[PDB]
Amino acid sequence: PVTINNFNYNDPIDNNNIIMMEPPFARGTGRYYKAFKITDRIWIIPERYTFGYKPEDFNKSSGIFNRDVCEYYDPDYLNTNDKKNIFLQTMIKLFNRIKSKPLGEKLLEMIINGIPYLGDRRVPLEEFNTNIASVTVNKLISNPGEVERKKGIFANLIIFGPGPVLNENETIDIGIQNHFASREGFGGIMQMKFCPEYVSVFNNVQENKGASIFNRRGYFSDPALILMHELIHVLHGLYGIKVDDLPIVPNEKKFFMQSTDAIQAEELYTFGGQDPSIITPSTDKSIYDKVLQNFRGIVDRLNKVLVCISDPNININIYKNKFKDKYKFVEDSEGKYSIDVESFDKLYKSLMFGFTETNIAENYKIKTRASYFSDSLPPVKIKNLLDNEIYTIEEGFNISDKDMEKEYRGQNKAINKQAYEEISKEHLAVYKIQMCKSVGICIDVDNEDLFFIADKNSFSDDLSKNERIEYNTQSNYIENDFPINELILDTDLISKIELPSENTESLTDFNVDVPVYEKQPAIKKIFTDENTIFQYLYSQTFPLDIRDISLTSSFDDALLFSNKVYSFFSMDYIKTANKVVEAGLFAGWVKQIVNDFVIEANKSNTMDKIADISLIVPYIGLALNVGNETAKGNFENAFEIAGASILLEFIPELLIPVVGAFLLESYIDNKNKIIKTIDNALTKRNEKWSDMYGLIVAQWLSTVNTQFYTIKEGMYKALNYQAQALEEIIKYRYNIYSEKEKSNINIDFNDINSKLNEGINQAIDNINNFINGCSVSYLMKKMIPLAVEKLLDFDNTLKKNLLNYIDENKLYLIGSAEYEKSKVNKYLKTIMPFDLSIYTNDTILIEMFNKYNSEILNNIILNLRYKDNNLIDLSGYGAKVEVYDGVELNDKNQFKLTSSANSKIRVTQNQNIIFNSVFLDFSVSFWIRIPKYKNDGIQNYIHNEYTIINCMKNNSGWKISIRGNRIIWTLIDINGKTKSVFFEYNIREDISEYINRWFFVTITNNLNNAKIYINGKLESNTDIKDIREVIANGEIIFKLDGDIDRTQFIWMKYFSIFNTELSQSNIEERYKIQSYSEYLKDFWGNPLMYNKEYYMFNAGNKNSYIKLKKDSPVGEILTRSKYNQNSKYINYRDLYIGEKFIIRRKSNSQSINDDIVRKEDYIYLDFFNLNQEWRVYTYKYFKKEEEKLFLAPISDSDEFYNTIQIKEYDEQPTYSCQLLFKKDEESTDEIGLIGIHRFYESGIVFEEYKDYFCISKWYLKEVKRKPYNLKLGCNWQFIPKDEGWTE
Ligand SMILES: [Zn+2]
Ligand SMILES: [Zn+2]
C-alpha cells in the first residue's frame, strides 16, 4: 500500500526524508528549499512557486496571467513557518483522503512507481544517464550555511505552494534543449504548484444550486479532487505519454469569441467526461500512435542498455526490471524485451481514460464541473480543511453525520456556509473585453462569458488521406473509455517490482529550460456597434448607487438611462411593475406583479404544435437578441422558418473532408489474400463512417453546443436580472411608506423572492430543454447530413474501386468473383446509422439525444409550409422547392393544383437523409379537397386516373393518384414491382363527408404494410412484403398528370413526410392539431366568413333545408331535392337550396365588407328575402321548452332577442357549429340553441307533422354530454357556392 509520512515544518533536516533541495529550475544555483518526503519519490516544498515569475507579479494588478481565470492574489500566503506547516499538514490530509479509496491509492502507487527513465532523447540507446535535470535533483547535505556537500536523488513529483495566482494550480514538466522527456516515453521529474485553501467554484447550468437564485448558488470544489486532477497530469508526464498533438484552438476572429490558450487533448483526457469527445477519433489514434512509438523506443533501449555512465552504483538489472514493469513490457525466457499490444492497450487506456477527474469524482462521490468548457466563477476560501467538523479524509465536505452526503450538500455554497468565505474582489483580476460603440458607451464583459467557438484548425484532416488495404489490414478503434471497476480490481497493474534507492550521484549538468511568465492586460478594448447578447444583458442591469428604477420595453432607453431597466416581458407586466399605489393597496399589488412575473416566465413552456414544434421560449430573442437579430420581429415565426440556426451567434465552417481513396493490394493467384483485402476494405469503410461521425461530434460540442451553453447561461442571467429589478422596485416602493404604514402592510419579502426564484427555476428547466433540443437539432440536420454526403460520395468511389478490383482478379478469384461482386453491393448499400452514444457516454448528452429521437416531430423530413407568398420546406433539412406560376397559394396554407402545365411544384429532397432504412419506413400526410365530379362528365371522372404527386428515381418510387372518387397510393421497387393501396369515398350519398370537403390523409409504410388513414381512421391496408427496395428520395413533382378534364383541380395543405411509420395515435393527434382554429369553418372546411352568402345544413337532419314559409314569419323545414339525371354512378341531395343566409358582425361597425367569424363571436344571423335582408329572431317571452324562430325584416324590437353567439361545443374536429341565444352578451342567462323541432298540425283537411327552424333549451344540456353528439339538431354548417360543387 501507500505510506503517507508525518512531520512538522520545524522538524530537523535529516538529509533523507527532510532535506534542503535544489529545485530543477534553480539551475543549480540560488537557495535551497526545505523539502519533505510525503511518500516515496514525492516531495512537498511548502513555499510559493517563484520560478519564471516576477516578485511584484505576486501582487494583484491591472494585469492577469490567464485570460480564463478569475485570478486571486495574496503575496502573504505561506509567508510564515506556521503557514508552511498548515500547508504541510493539509497536504498530508489530502494525500490520506486520496488513498482512503482503492482508486486514489492506485493513482498514488502508479505515480510512486512510475519513475522516470534514466535518460532522455539525447542519451545513447545503450546508456543510462542520470546526470540530467529531469532525472536527478540535488539535496544539500553540508551543515547549515555552506553548499560544500551535495548529494543527488531520484524523484517523481515535487509539489510547491502556489505561484502568483493561488487558484491557478499547474503541473509542470522539464524541458531541455527544447524537448520534454515526459512527452517522449521517458518521463521526468514533475513539478506542481498547488493551493488547497483557495478552490474553484462552479454550478450545474442544467440545474440549480438548492433551487436558490437570490442565494449563493454554485458549488465549491473538493481540494482533493483538484489535487488528483493535477496528479493525473503528473501520471501522464511520469510515463512520458504527455504528448502534444493537434490542439483545440479557439476561433478569435469575432469580438464575441472567447480567447483562450490552445487546449491539448491530454488536458481533455484528464478531465474525462464529454471532453474526450471533443478530440476526434483521428487525433485519438494520432496520439495513441505517437505514444506507442515512444514505448517502442524505450523497449528498444532496454534491450540495448549496457551501462550507466553517470553513476557507477546504479544496478542495470534492477532498473531493467523496474522499467519493464513500469511500461508493462513482456520478456521471453531469454531476457529479450518486447511490446505486448494487449498490455500496452490496457495500460494506455487506463492512464488516458481510466484516471480522469470525472471518474474519480464519481468514485469519491465528489461534485465537479460538467465540462472543461464551463464558465468559471470566482474562487472561494475553505476556512479550515484541518477541522474534521468541516472536512474529513473519508468524505471530504460531504459528511453524512451532518447530512451533507446527499446531493453533494457539503459543497453547496447555499448550504455549507460555515465551510467557506467569499473573496475580496479587490484581490481578484479577470480578463475583460471592453465593448465600445464608435461614439460613447462601453460595456465590460468577462472573457469567460464570451462564446467559445473552436477554430476549424482544431480538427484533423486525416480522413482525407489515402489508405492502402491488405489481407492483414485491420480496423482501428480507440474507445475514450475504460471500466473503472476493472481498474480498481485489476490485480497485475500495481507494480510488485522493487523501487530502486533514491540516492545517486549529484547532478552537475543543470542545463534546463525555465519558463518565463508575465501578465498581460486584464482589459482589451474593442469597437462594435452591435447590440447582441452582451449589450442586451447589460441593458437589464443598473448601478448599485441607484435605487429608484423603472422597467421599459425599449432597449435603447434602457442603455441610455441608468434608472431605466430593460425588460423582455409583456407590456402589461412592465406597466404594472411601474405602477405606484397607496399603502393599503401595496400588498395586493405585490401579489399581482409577482404573480405576473411567474406567468410571464412560465411562457417558456409555450407550445407551437401547428408548426410542428413542441416547445418554444418566445421571449429568448427579446431577452438576448442573440444570433441573427432575434429581438426584431416575432421570434416564434423566425424560429419556425430558420430553426436553431437563428440563435447561433456564429455559424461554423465545418471540416468535412473527402475521404481518401483506398489503394487495394493485389495478390496474383492468391484467392485468400484477395478476398481478405476486399473484406478489410469493407470494414475499413465502416471505420471511415464512424470516424467521420466522431469528427462531426467533436465540432458540434466545441463550436455549436458551446454557443448553446452561453445562451442557456445568458437566459439564466436575464431571468435573474429581471427578478432583481422587480425586487428593487418592490423594496423602493415599500420603503417610501412610513413605519406606521409599513407596520400594517402584510408583505413577506422572503416569500416574494421565493415565488420569483421558483418561477425562474421552472423557466430555466424549460429553456434548457428547449436549447438542448435546438443543439441536437442543429447536429442532426445541419451537420450530420453534410457528412453523410461526403461519405456517400466516398462509398460510390469505393464501390467502383472494389468492382474494378474484383474484375482485374476475375481469374485469380476463380468462381467467386461474382459472389463477392454482390457482397460489395450489399455492404455499401446499408449506411451507418449515427449514434451519439458511440462517441460519448456522457449521460446528459445521451439523454439529450435519446429525447430528441423519441419525439416523432423530429422524424419530419419534409414539411412544406406557406411563407411570404411561397411554399418552403420547414423540416430543417433544406429541401429545394420550386412553385410554378400555375399554383395558387393563400396564407391559410392551401395550394391549388389545376390542369395548367405550369401548375406544379418541384421538390428536390435532401439526398443525405437516412430515408432508405433498408426496410421501407416512412409516412406521408396532408389535407386534400377534391372537387365534385361534373354530372355531364361522370364517365371520365370514374375511368380517368391521374397522378397528383409523383416521386420517382430509376423507375422506382411512389406516387399519389386519383381516379374519380378514389385516392391511390402506389409503390414501385427497383425491379418494377408495383403495389397499391387506396381509399374510395361513396358518390351516391345524399350528403357526402368527403366530396369537395377538406379531409386529412395519412399514408404509412413499414416492411409489411402500406396503410391509408383518413381523418385519423384507418381505411385500408395492403401487404407490401413482396415489394423490394423502393427509391423514395427522388424529386417530388406536385402536378395533375394523366387524362384530365380542363376543369380538373385539387386543393392541398400541410404536406408532410416522416422517415418513420406513424402510429394511429400520432395520426389522430396530427389530425386534431391541424384541425384546430380559433374560428369556425364552413361546410367545405374553410374559415367561416362574415358578409358571405351561405345556405344552411343541419347535421341532425342532413336532407333538410330552411325555407321562409309563404304566409308566416317562420322557417319551415323542407326535404332537399335530389340528383335528377339517370346516371347509375351518382346520387346526391342539392346543397344550394333554401334561404341564402349571411352572417353579420355585432360589435365594431367597421362597415360590412368581409372577415373571419371566431368562436364566441356575437353575430346577427340574416338571410335574403328577395331584395331585402331579413333577420333571425327569438320571441323573448316563451315558457315552453322550445319555440319557432321569428323571421322578419331588420328591426330592433323590445320583444325579440336578435343577438346570437356562435359557439363550438365539440372538442373534436368538426365543421359543425352551434348558435346560442343569450339574454345579452353579459348575462349567463342562456335562452337556448337554434335547431329543428317537429310539430303536429291538424287542420280541417290536412293532418301532419312538420318541422320548423327553432330555438330549444333542451340542447343546452345535450351539448355538454361526452362524447359530443354530432347528430344533434343544433349542429349547423354553412354552405357557400363553390366551384368545387356544381349541381
Ligand atoms: Zn489540466
Ligand atoms: Zn470555455
**Residue 1130: how many CA atoms within 13 Å on its side-chain side?**
24
**Residue 51: how many CA atoms within 13 Å on its side-chain side?**
27
Paired with 36 in beta bridges are 18, 44
Q: Would you call 230 a catalytic residue per the annotation? A: yes
CA 1237 to ligand 2 centroid distance, Å: 75
Nearest Cα to 525, choosing from 440, 462, 428? Answer: 440
Give Cβ neighbours of residue 312 (< 8 Å, ≥ 6 apart): none
Amino acid at 440: G
Q: Closest-lying ligand to the alpha carbon of 226?
A: 1
Q: Quick one: 1051 and 1129 in the same domain?
A: no
Q: Quick one: 1059 and 1169 in the same domain?
A: no
Q: Quick one: 732 and 868 in the same domain?
A: no
CA 489 to ligand 1 centroid distance, Å: 26
CB 2 within 8 A of CB 112: yes
Where does residue 794 rank: exposed (0-12), middle (13-18), buried (19+ CB within 10 A)? buried
Q: Spell out the long-range contacts of 50-53 with Cβ–Cβ below 8 A and sequence spacing 24 or more.
A: 50/163, 51/23, 51/25, 51/26, 51/163, 51/514, 51/515, 52/25, 52/514, 52/515, 52/516, 52/517, 53/163, 53/164, 53/517
CB 212 within 8 A of CB 198: no
Range 1161-1171 burial, b when 16+ CB lie within 10 A, else e: bebbbbbeeee
CA 706 to ligand 2 centroid distance, Å: 8
CA 226 to ligand 1 centroid distance, Å: 9
Q: Which helix (H) or strand (E) holds 111?
A: helix 102-113
Q: Quick one: 195 and 125 in the same domain?
A: yes
Write out the three cell numbers for 30.
540560488
CA 702 to ligand 2 centroid distance, Å: 9
- Last residue of a domain, which of 438, 461, 481? 438
Distances (CA, A) of 827 to 232, 466, 681, 820, 956: 43, 21, 11, 10, 21
Phi-psi region of 1274 (alpha: psi -120 to 50; beta: other; left: phi over 0): alpha
**Residue 1190: how many CA atoms within 13 Å on its side-chain side?**
17
Domain contains 54: yes
CA 545 to ligand 2 centroid distance, Å: 32
What count of residues does the chain have?
Answer: 1287
Domain contains 164: yes
CA–CA separation, 455 and 699 (whole Å): 9
Give Cβ neighbours of residue 941 (< 8 Å, ≥ 6 apart): 933, 934, 964, 965, 1045
Q: Quick one: 1060 and 1155 in the same domain?
A: no
Domain contains 736: yes
Range 403-412 burial, b when 16+ CB lie within 10 A, else e: ebbeebbbbb
Q: Quick one: 410 and 463 in the same domain?
A: no
CA–CA separation, 1176 and 1251 (whole Å): 17
Alpha helices (runs of H) in 983-1076, residue ranges in sequence order: 1064-1075
Supply the DSSP symbol for 393. T
CA 1221 to ligand 2 centroid distance, Å: 65
Give Cβ neighbours of residue 656 (< 8 Å, ≥ 6 apart): 692, 695, 696, 786, 787, 789, 790
Query: How would you classify the pairing of strands 662-664 and 467-469?
Result: parallel
Range 480-496 burial, b when 16+ CB lie within 10 A, else e: bebebeebbeeeebbbe
Alpha helices (runs of H) in 184-280, residue ranges in sequence order: 223-238, 265-271
CATH number at residue 282: 3.90.1240.10
Q: Closest-lying ligand to the alpha carbon of 172?
A: 1
CA 223 to ligand 2 centroid distance, Å: 21
Q: Quick one: 785 and 915 in the same domain?
A: no
Maximum Cα–Cα distance for the chain, whole Å? Answer: 146
Q: Which helix (H) or strand (E) holds 779?
A: helix 749-782
Q: Quick one: 423 and 445 in the same domain?
A: no
- Last residue of a domain, which of 1026, 1043, 1075? 1075
Domain contains 1083: no
For residue 235, the Cα-to-chain-centroid distance in whole angstroms is 35
Could you give the angle at the alpha carbon of 51 between the alpha carbons of 64 and 81, nearest 5°?
Answer: 100
CA 779 to ligand 1 centroid distance, Å: 28
Nearest Cα to 18, choosing from 191, 153, 189? Answer: 153
Q: Is 427 annotated as a binding residue?
A: no
Where does residue 742 rank: exposed (0-12), middle (13-18), buried (19+ CB within 10 A)? middle
Exactly one of 22, 230, 636, 1061 is catalytic; name it.
Answer: 230
Question: In 471-600, at which residue ranges do the beta strands (DSSP E only) sit?
Answer: 503-504, 520-521, 523-527, 550-552, 564-566
CA 269 to ligand 1 centroid distance, Å: 9
CA–CA separation, 908 and 912 (whole Å): 12
CA–CA separation, 408 and 1031 (whole Å): 55
Domain contains 1039: yes
Give Cβ neighbours of residue 545 (< 8 Å, ≥ 6 apart): none
CA 156 to ligand 1 centroid distance, Å: 18
Q: Is 815 helix (H, G, I), strand (E, B) or coil?
A: coil
Where does residue 740 rank: exposed (0-12), middle (13-18), buried (19+ CB within 10 A)? exposed
Q: Is 1236 annotated as a binding residue?
A: yes
CA 268 to ligand 2 centroid distance, Å: 12
Helix 316-326 to helix 102-113 angle (10° resolution) is: 140
Q: Closest-lying ligand to the alpha carbon of 265?
A: 1
Q: Quick one: 370 and 457 in the same domain?
A: no
Q: Is 236 annotated as a binding residue?
A: no
CATH number at residue 1116: 2.80.10.50
CATH number at residue 684: 1.20.1120.10
CA 85 to ligand 1 centroid distance, Å: 27
CB 601 within 8 A of CB 759: yes
**What is the domain range of residue 1229?**
1089-1279
Query: How would you classify the pairing of strands 1104-1108 and 1093-1098?
Result: unpaired
Q: Closest-lying ligand to the alpha carbon of 267?
A: 1
- Last residue of a domain, which of 394, 417, 438? 438
In the numeric block, the cell 401548375 is attached to 903
CATH number at residue 954: 2.60.120.200
What is the CB neighbour count within 10 angstroms for residue 833? 11
CA–CA separation, 893 and 844 (whole Å): 38
Write out the three cell numbers for 1083.
361546410
For residue 662, the Cα-to-chain-centroid distance in whole angstroms is 36
CA–CA separation, 764 and 205 (whole Å): 9
Q: Quick one: 377 and 463 in the same domain?
A: no
Phi-psi region of 1070 (alpha: psi -120 to 50; beta: other; left: phi over 0): alpha
Residue 538 — φ and ψ, nearest 5°? Answer: -60, -45
Write out the three cell numbers for 211.
433551487
Domain contains 913: yes
Q: Closest-lying ligand to the alpha carbon of 229?
A: 1
CA–CA separation, 377 and 774 (whole Å): 26
Where does residue 1153 rank: exposed (0-12), middle (13-18), buried (19+ CB within 10 A)? exposed
For residue 394, the Cα-to-chain-centroid distance in whole angstroms is 37
CB 224 within 8 A of CB 364: yes
Counted domains in the chain: 4
Domain contains 1229: yes
Range 1015-1045 burial, b when 16+ CB lie within 10 A, else e: bbeebbebebeebebbbbbbbbbbbbbeebe
Q: Quick one: 430 and 457 in the same domain?
A: no
Q: Closest-lying ligand to the alpha carbon of 371?
A: 2
What is the CB neighbour count within 10 angstroms for residue 515? 10
Distances (CA, A) of 182 to 293, 353, 702: 14, 18, 28
Q: Is 229 annotated as a binding residue?
A: yes
CA–CA separation, 1056 and 871 (whole Å): 12
Q: Closest-lying ligand to the alpha carbon of 451?
A: 2
Q: Is 1237 annotated as a binding residue?
A: yes
Domain contains 833: no
Q: Closest-lying ligand to the alpha carbon of 237?
A: 1
Q: Quick one: 859 and 918 in the same domain?
A: yes
Q: Is 267 annotated as a binding residue?
A: yes
CA 714 to ligand 2 centroid distance, Å: 14
Q: Is 1283 annotated as a binding residue?
A: no
Write out the three cell numbers for 217.
448558488
Q: Is 1142 annotated as a binding residue?
A: no
Write out the three cell numbers for 758.
421558483
Distances (CA, A) of 899 to 136, 175, 265, 1084, 1098: 92, 80, 63, 22, 34
Helices (H) and strands (E) in the chain, counts: 25, 65
CA–CA separation, 176 and 316 (whole Å): 25
